[PDB]
Design an enzyme around this catalytic site. Sequence first.
Site, PDB file in Angstrom:
ATOM      1  CG  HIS A  40      -0.644   0.518   2.424  1.00  0.00           C
ATOM      2  ND1 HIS A  40      -0.394  -0.342   3.474  1.00  0.00           N
ATOM      3  CD2 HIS A  40      -0.571   1.772   2.928  1.00  0.00           C
ATOM      4  CE1 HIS A  40      -0.177   0.377   4.563  1.00  0.00           C
ATOM      5  NE2 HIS A  40      -0.250   1.678   4.246  1.00  0.00           N
ATOM      6  CG  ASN A  54      16.068  15.744  12.014  1.00  0.00           C
ATOM      7  OD1 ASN A  54      15.340  15.893  11.025  1.00  0.00           O
ATOM      8  ND2 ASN A  54      15.957  16.489  13.104  1.00  0.00           N
ATOM      9  CG  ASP A  84      -0.035  -3.744   2.942  1.00  0.00           C
ATOM     10  OD1 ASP A  84       0.489  -3.347   1.868  1.00  0.00           O
ATOM     11  OD2 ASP A  84      -0.390  -2.975   3.883  1.00  0.00           O
ATOM     12  N   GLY A 175       2.062   6.944   8.320  1.00  0.00           N
ATOM     13  CA  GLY A 175       3.432   7.360   8.064  1.00  0.00           C
ATOM     14  C   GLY A 175       4.448   6.343   8.616  1.00  0.00           C
ATOM     15  CB  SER A 177       2.307   2.692   6.171  1.00  0.00           C
ATOM     16  OG  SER A 177       1.067   2.733   6.824  1.00  0.00           O
ATOM     17  N   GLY A 178       4.652   0.311   6.266  1.00  0.00           N
ATOM     18  CA  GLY A 178       5.737  -0.280   5.504  1.00  0.00           C
ATOM     19  C   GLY A 178       6.971  -0.602   6.337  1.00  0.00           C
TER      20      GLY A 178
HETATM   21 CA    CA Z   1      18.950  12.951   7.990  1.00  0.00          CA
END
Ligand code: CA
Length: 223
Positions: A40, A54, A84, A175, A177-178
């Site tokens: 997905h 970061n 999935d 976010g 996800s996966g």
């Molecule tokens: Ca970075």
Amino acid sequence: IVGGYTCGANTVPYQVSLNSGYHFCGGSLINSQWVVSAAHCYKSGIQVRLGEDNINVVEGNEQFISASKSIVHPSYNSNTLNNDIMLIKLKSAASLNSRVASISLPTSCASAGTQCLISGWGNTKSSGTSYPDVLKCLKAPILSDSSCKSAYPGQITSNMFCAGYLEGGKDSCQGDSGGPVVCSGKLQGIVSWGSGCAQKNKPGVYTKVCNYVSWIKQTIASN
Ligand SMILES: [Ca+2]
């Protein structure tokens, strides 16, 4: 991740960010040239970002490598999210060191009660929206198949498992996800779906990676 903690820079060395101009999904590095994610999460124009903490600052351990090929599972159903899972090949091999490393595939499935580490750059609020810049982590147990099916009647297949906390407050989210679910050093799950995030009696639902090891191996061997 809702109700988790700051992992620490490069402490989850197989965690990747999929970027199409912006972070949109997680993935797991499973060898120098392949990433496992959720089907997905499919889109064209993916760049794989390894060595990230970061995601908005170049900190010095990143490797940015374009996808050369994506392979969604042959039996992926986007309506039910059965199967999935997708594989992404990198245009070039990543350089593997302590901060960028592959995660082992399972040789057997995990069971209810096993604690696992779930990680990602997804939403941190359950009734709100806040996206972190650094990688967040959550320790969570696998839940029984029966409690999983009870939470989500008629929706849990043999290629899914639930993990987290029925009381709510601690979960993966949009976010994430996966991204990975690693238990005793093996990739057992992929962040797939859930009703909201961190809601009571609505635990996270994860792709059951152990079911796909044969497919992953043969796909890698021929691509
Ligand atoms: Ca970075």
